[PDB]
Every structure is written in structure tokens, then in C-alpha cells.
Amino acid sequence: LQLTLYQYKTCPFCSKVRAFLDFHALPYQVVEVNPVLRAEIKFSSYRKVPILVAQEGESSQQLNDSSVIISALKTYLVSGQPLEEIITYYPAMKAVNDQGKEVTEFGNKYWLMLNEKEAQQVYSGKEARTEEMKWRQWADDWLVHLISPNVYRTPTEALASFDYIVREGKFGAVEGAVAKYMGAAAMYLISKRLKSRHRLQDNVREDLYEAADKWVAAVGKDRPFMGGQKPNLADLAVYGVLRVMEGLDAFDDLMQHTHIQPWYLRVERAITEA
Amino acid sequence: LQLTLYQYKTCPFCSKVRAFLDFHALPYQVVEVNPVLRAEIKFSSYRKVPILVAQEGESSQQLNDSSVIISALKTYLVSGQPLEEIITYYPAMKAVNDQGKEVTEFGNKYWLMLNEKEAQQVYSGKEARTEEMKWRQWADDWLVHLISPNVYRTPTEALASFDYIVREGKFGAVEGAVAKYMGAAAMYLISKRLKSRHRLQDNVREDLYEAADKWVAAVGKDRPFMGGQKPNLADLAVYGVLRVMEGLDAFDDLMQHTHIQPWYLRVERAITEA
Ligand code: HEM
Ligand code: HEM
Ligand SMILES: N[C@@H](CCC(=O)N[C@@H](CS)C(=O)NCC(=O)O)C(=O)O
Numbered sequence: 328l329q330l331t332l333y334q335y336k337t338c339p340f341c342s343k344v345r346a347f348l349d350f351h352a353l354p355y356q357v358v359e360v361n362p363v364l365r366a367e368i369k370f371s372s373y374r375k376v377p378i379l380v381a382q383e384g385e386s387s388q389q390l391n392d393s394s395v396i397i398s399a400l401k402t403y404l405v406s407g408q409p410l411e412e413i414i415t416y417y418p419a420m421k422a423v424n425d426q427g428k429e430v431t432e433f434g435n436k437y438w439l440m441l442n443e444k445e446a447q448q449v450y451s452g453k454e455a456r457t458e459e460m461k462w463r464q465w466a467d468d469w470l471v472h473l474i475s476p477n478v479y480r481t482p483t484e485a486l487a488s489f490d491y492i493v494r495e496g497k498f499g500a501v502e503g504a505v506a507k508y509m510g511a512a513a514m515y516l517i518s519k520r521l522k523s524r525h526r527l528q529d530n531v532r533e534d535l536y537e538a539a540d541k542w543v544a545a546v547g548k549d550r551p552f553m554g555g556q557k558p559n560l561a562d563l564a565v566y567g568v569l570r571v572m573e574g575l576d577a578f579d580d581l582m583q584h585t586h587i588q589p590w591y592l593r594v595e596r597a598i599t600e601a
Numbered sequence: 602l603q604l605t606l607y608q609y610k611t612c613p614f615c616s617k618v619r620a621f622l623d624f625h626a627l628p629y630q631v632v633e634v635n636p637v638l639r640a641e642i643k644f645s646s647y648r649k650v651p652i653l654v655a656q657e658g659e660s661s662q663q664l665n666d667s668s669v670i671i672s673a674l675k676t677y678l679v680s681g682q683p684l685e686e687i688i689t690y691y692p693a694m695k696a697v698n699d700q701g702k703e704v705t706e707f708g709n710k711y712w713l714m715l716n717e718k719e720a721q722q723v724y725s726g727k728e729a730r731t732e733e734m735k736w737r738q739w740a741d742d743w744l745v746h747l748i749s750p751n752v753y754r755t756p757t758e759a760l761a762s763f764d765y766i767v768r769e770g771k772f773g774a775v776e777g778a779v780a781k782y783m784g785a786a787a788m789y790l791i792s793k794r795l796k797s798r799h800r801l802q803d804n805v806r807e808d809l810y811e812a813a814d815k816w817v818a819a820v821g822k823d824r825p826f827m828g829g830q831k832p833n834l835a836d837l838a839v840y841g842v843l844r845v846m847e848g849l850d851a852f853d854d855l856m857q858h859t860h861i862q863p864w865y866l867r868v869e870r871a872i873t874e875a
């Protein structure tokens with residue numbers, strides 16, 4: 328079972344997949360995608376990264392949405408059911424936007440295709456299962472929208488972030504130097520629109536802190552992670568989403584004003600412990 | 602198990618719920634919602650119809666999306682699992698539109714929460730299960746978008762349709778006479794935009810006929826319905842969606858130019874046979 332992950336390292340959707348693979352000690356290779364030319368992805372009719380192709384010797388299936396990848400792989404790890412059949416339970420649902428745009432959403436994306444035995448094996452608590460589902464969705468429908476406006480809220484942070492983008496990702500020597508400044512400028516302005524369009528407070532940091540408190544509160548003081556003893560897909564989701572900011576001002580702020588660090592480090596070490 | 606269905610009779614989403622309840626001979630009461638004032642719905646924080654509240658003596662849960670209602674009730678009929686727990690597996694997923702609008706989608710909406718035994722009892726064929734899921738989604742992400750532009754493509758049909766709307770539904774004597782003309786006018790013009798926005802051919806009828814052929818072809822000549830022996834959620838979905846046009850020109854056209862009538866009548870009589 329060989330796994331190749333096409334990604335943008337500092338992109339939350341990819342950080343999520345990595346968090347999951349890292350925690351389930353699954354071996355995988357990563358091919359960094361050039362965000363400008365995206366050549367390493369020209370082979371996939373699915374135009375968004377991350378994309379992960381799994382290979383079983385001769386067989387090979389392409390898993391697309393980041394949450395779908397995680398769900399497919401996860402149910403795979405517990406049910407053993409052939410992966411070529413599992414991605415079938417996460418159908419790509421095309422539909423024309425109310426604005427006339429073709430959009431694809433993946434059905435059942437946050438639901439592990441498990442049977443009674445299997446479920447009990449990973450949740451042991453019917454409500455615990457619908458819970459990660461709810462927070463998994465929360466992670467990328469709310470938490471991620473707090474990143475850009477936060478890591479690009481100031482021209483300095485903007486440059487810091489895009490610098491961290493060019494260094495980390497795959498940019499030619501030239502498309503990098505340029506991209507840092509054009510990029511930070513673009514993103515600084517664009518994040519302004521995102522700040523607005525997503526109904527964020529004027530003080531973007533406060534939406535981040537609140538989100539964090541909401542999460543720690545949800546985790547509660549009766550358990551290490553939402554997954555209880557060990558982290559479940561929800562812990563990995565929030566963590567995966569938040570990590571992308573490691574090294575940036577927003578992250579230190581987040582850590583210094585929210586009581587979320589203990590949970591965060593707990594997941595980080597739960598992961599490093601392969 | 603008392604069921605109350607709040608609806609707009611001629612509305613496809615409601616026609617779908619009725620097709621399902623009708624087929625599973627489930628007793629239910631319907632309270633027609635006044636599309637203008639919507640007073641009979643003022644009690645629900647969920648602002649779309651259909652809505653169906655189920656009551657078990659003292660207990661009572663509100664099922665919201667039309668497909669969610671069908672999926673909840675259906676898994677309920679086969680698993681016997683308490684309905685208050687089942688609606689839990691169809692979480693309401695809020696998210697801010699790319700246009701900045703708060704939108705709610707229901708997770709797992711096309712998936713019956715069944716275990717191995719149960720599934721074999723209703724599908725007997727792993728692929729047969731993912732199949733209705735695919736067509737269920739097809740029914741309301743494509744088929745329904747063919748209705749308005751078809752039953753409102755002409756000022757005459759427009760009036761015919763809205764006449765059938767005021768008569769059928771709940772409109773005061775006055776808000777009815779007015780609504781027929783204001784309504785038909787509005788819908789005639791609005792359907793034009795829908796025709797465009799949804800990428801329909803200029804000859805709106807052709808999109809309908811093609812959709813129908815696609816469906817009959819899908820069903821094939823080796824089985825009465827997609828559900829095979831009896832209809833499954835997919836047959837009820839397409840049927841439920843198409844019925845809304847019964848009595849209108851588009852429906853007769855649909856019936857006279859597509860080879861879909863035999864399947865249609867099969868579902869209709871399958872239903873009348875309580
Ligand atoms: C190369 C490094 C990249 C990074 C670090 C990055 C980072 C992010 C982040 C943090 C978000 C969430 C912020 C928000 O939605 O307000 C986001 C969203 C998004 N990104 Fe990227 N991105 C990258 C490249 C790209 C590229 C090249 C494209 C276009 C081809 C792209 C398209 C999008 C889209 C469409 C969304 C919104 C997805 C959704 O609605 O959930 N991103 N990206
Ligand atoms: C009273 C009788 C009504 C009937 C017969 C009716 C019929 C329909 C039909 C046939 C469609 C699908 C056509 C298309 O999407 O192009 C539709 C969609 C829709 N209707 Fe109604 N409708 C009614 C009332 C209303 C009212 C009062 C509202 C607003 C409060 C409403 C809001 C919508 C919306 C938002 C959609 C699109 C849903 C989606 O994206 O799947 N409808 N309606
Ligand atoms: N919901 C998707 C997100 C896909 C996405 O937005 N990916 C971006 C990179 S951050 C992309 O490749 N952009 C292509 C596009 O949106 O056209 C997932 O979880 O994988």
C-alpha cells in the first residue's frame with residue numbers, strides 16, 4: 328500500500344492529510360505541487376490539492392477531497408475493505424452553483440464507512456462518532472477561514488507568511504522572489520475581502536481566540552483529546568488546520584492567549600510517537 | 602409514531618417526501634404552508650419546507666431536509682433504532698458561502714444508516730446501495746432544475762402552473778387571484794434566468810427528455826425499477842420530482858416523447874397499492 332500525497336505544505340487542507348497519515352504511522356511520499364504552474368498535478372481531472380493516489384502493486388485509486396482522503400484511508404485501516412470500493416461511498420457530487428458555477432462536493436465526506444463491530448472499535452460511543460463528524464466539518468467550514476485574515480492581517484505578517492510559503496513550497500528561484508512580494512500584496516488585500524465575506528470581527532485575532540476556546544471547551548477537561556484516550560479525526564482536523572500557522576505571529580498569539588496549547592502539544596507528541 | 606408534514610404540495614421537495622411516505626404506507630398528516638406568509642412554519646428555526654415532525658407520544662423530533670427526512674424515516678423503518686438518535690447521523694452543516702451567505706447542507710443525506718444485515722435486507726447488492734445514492738442526488742441536483750424552466754417556459758404554461766399552485770396550495774382568496782398573475786409573470790421571467798444559470802438547452806424540453814432517457818436507460822430493461830423488484834429511494838426520488846408536473850403541459854410532453862411512462866406508471870401503481 329504505497330501512498331503519494333500531492334500537496335501545498337503550508338496549505339491547511341494538506342496539513343490535515345499529513346496530520347492523519349503521520350498519526351496513523353502510514354508511510355507515504357509527498358510531491359510538492361508548484362502553486363503557479365501546478366504541473367505535478369496535470370494528470371488529475373480533479374483540480375484541487377491535496378490529492379492522494381494509493382497503490383496496491385498493480386491497482387491504484389485517486390482519493391481527492393482532503394476529508395475524503397482521510398475518511399477513505401481511515402475506514403480502510405479498520406475495515407480492511409478494498410480501497411477501490413471504499414472511495415465509492417464518497418461520491419463526487421457535481422451541481423451547478425446558484426451563481427452558475429460547476430461545483431463538486433463529496434458526499435458522506437465526514438462519515439467512516441464502518442460496521443457495528445468496527446465502529447465500537449474506534450468510537451465506543453454512538454454520540455462520540457457524530458461528534459467528530461460535527462467538529463471535522465467545523466474545522467474546515469469555520470476554523471480554516473480564520474487563517475488567512477490572521478496570517479495576512481498585516482503587511483509584515485503577510486510577507487512573513489508568503490516568505491514561509493515560497494521557502495516551504497515549490498517555486499523556481501525567480502517565481503519565488505517575485506511571488507513573495509506580489510504574493511504578500513495580493514494575499515494582504517485578498518484577506519481583507521475574506522475577513523469581510525466570512526463575517527469576521529474587525530480584530531481578526533479575536534475570532535481565532537474564540538474558535539480556540541470553543542474547541543478546548545468542546546474537548547473538555549475530562550479527556551486528553553476529543554477522541555478521548557487518543558486523538559480521533561476531529562483532533563487531527565483542528566490540529567492539522569492550526570499547524571499551518573506554526574512559525575507565524577498568529578500562531579504564537581493563538582498559543583499565548585487561549586489555553587489551547589496543552590491540547591495542541593498533546594496531539595503533536597501523540598503524533599511524533601509514531 | 603405520528604407524522605406531520607409541512608409542505609407546498611406542488612413543490613418537488615415535498616412531492617418527494619409524500620412519494621416516500623405513500624409508498625411505505627406511513628400514516629401522516631399534512632399541513633399546507635402558505636408560501637407567502639409561511640405562518641404554519643413559524644415555530645421552526647429551519648426556514649425551508651418540507652419539514653416533518655415525528656411524535657412518539659411525549660417525544661418529538663423535527664426532520665428538515667427532504668432527503669434527510671426520507672433517509673431518517675427509512676433507516677428508522679428498517680433498524681427500529683430510535684429516531685431521535687438517527688437524525689443525529691444527518692448533521693446540519695453550516696458554512697459561509699463563497700459569496701458570503703450562510704448555507705446549510707445536510708451530511709450523509711443520501712445514506713441510510715444501516716448495518717450489514719439491514720443493508721442486505723434492503724439492497725442485497727453493495728453496488729445497488731451506492732447506486733440509489735448517486736441517483737437520489739441526481740434527482741434533486743439536476744432533474745428538479747428542469748421543472749421550472751419547463752412548466753414556466755411559456756406565458757400560458759406559466760399561468761397554467763401558477764393557477765395549479767394557488768388552487769392546490771394555501772392562499773387567501775385575494776392573495777390568490779393576485780398571486781396567479783403576479784406569480785406567473787415573476788416565475789416566467791425568473792425561469793428564464795434559471796434556464797440560463799443552470800446551463801439548459803434553448804429548447805428546455807430537450808433537457809427534460811434527455812434526463813428522462815438517462816433515467817430509463819439507468820433503470821434498464823432487466824428490472825421494473827432501479828430498486829429492482831420494488832422501488833427504492835431512487836425511484837421514489839425521480840418519481841417524486843416528476844409528479845409535481847402532473848396536469849401540466851410539460852408532463853404530457855414528457856410522457857409522449859420519452860419511453861419513461863411505463864416506469865412512471867409502475868411506481869404510481871406500486872404506491873397506490875399501499
Ligand atoms: C501554495 C500555497 C497555498 C496555501 C498556503 C494556501 C492556503 C490556503 C488557506 C489557509 C486557505 C483557507 C483561508 C480561507 O479560506 O479564508 C485556503 C483556501 C483556498 N485556497 Fe489555498 N492555498 C495555497 C494555494 C492555493 C492555490 C494555488 C489555489 C488556486 C489554484 C488555492 C485556492 C484556494 C481555494 C479555492 C480556497 C477555498 C477552499 C474552500 O472554500 O474551503 N489555494 N488556501
Ligand atoms: C408554493 C409553491 C412552490 C413551488 C411549487 C415551488 C417549486 C419549486 C421548484 C419546482 C423548484 C426547482 C426548480 C429550480 O430549482 O430551477 C424550486 C426550487 C426552490 N424553491 Fe420553491 N417552490 C415553491 C415555493 C417556494 C417559496 C415560497 C420559496 C421561498 C421562500 C422557494 C424557494 C425555492 C428555492 C430556494 C429553491 C432552490 C432550492 C435548491 O437549490 O435545490 N420556493 N421550488
Ligand atoms: N475541500 C477541499 C479543498 C480543495 C482546495 O481548496 N484546494 C486548493 C488549494 S488550498 C486548490 O488546489 N485550489 C484549486 C481550485 O480551487 O481551483 C479539500 O479538503 O481537499
Ligand SMILES: N[C@@H](CCC(=O)N[C@@H](CS)C(=O)NCC(=O)O)C(=O)O
Pocket residue numbers: 609612613614648649650651665666667668
Ligand atoms: N434541499 C431542500 C430544499 C428546501 C427548499 O428549497 N425549500 C423551499 C421550497 S421549494 C423553501 O421553503 N424555501 C425557503 C428558502 O429557500 O429560503 C430539501 O430537500 O428539503
Ligand SMILES: [Cl-]
Pocket residue numbers: 365374
Ligand atoms: Cl487549473
Ligand SMILES: [Cl-]
Pocket residue numbers: 639648
Ligand atoms: Cl422566512
